[PDB]
Amino acid sequence: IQRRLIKSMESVMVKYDATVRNSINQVVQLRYGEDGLAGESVEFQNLATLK
Amino acid sequence: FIQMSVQRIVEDAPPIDLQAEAQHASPPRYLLKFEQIYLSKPTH
């Protein structure tokens, strides 16, 4: 399963346009994680104004 | 195995009877049946 997942996404990367495109420049996401943000620099937080 | 199964394998094999090429001019055969296996101790 891991190898099959990797071989389907191994060329998907964030370009200098800040968008996410595969090897053939087809756009997968306009921003990485639909926010453009790195996954290693985020935290868990609470929305105070909610409920 | 070496006591009885080899004996039964060597004895239940059918005898072979073999003729010539059906004639020579314008054919008898034989049976060659064998039994009673013997086994000896290792030798070198």
């Binding site: 370009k15 200098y16 346009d17 800040a18 968008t19 420049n25 | -």
Partner: protein, 82 residues
């Protein structure tokens, strides 16, 4: 693209930081002239780190946009992360 039309990030990404440091310390190892006065350190990687911190590396980065265009960002001109 012209200097007016620069849409890429002004932050030097970690990959640019790694590759610029490697390719500049390699030049220092091949006896390229240093851009910063050293205090006796002999390791080209530390020399390249000092040059990067002082913003004196004589290298610019060509960032290829997906459409095919590119931008020339000078190492002195964009923000270093660390």
């Amino acid at each position: 693209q012209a200097n007016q039309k620069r849409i890429t990030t002004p932050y030097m990404t970690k990959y640019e930081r790694a590759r610029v440091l490697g390719t500049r310390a390699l030049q220092i190892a091949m006896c390229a002239p240093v851009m910063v006065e050293l205090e006796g350190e002999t390791d080209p990687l530390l020399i390249a780190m000092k040059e990067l911190k002082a913003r004196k590396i004589p290298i610019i980065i060509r960032r290829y946009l997906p459409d095919g265009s590119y931008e020339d960002w000078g190492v002195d001109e964009l923000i270093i992360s660390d």
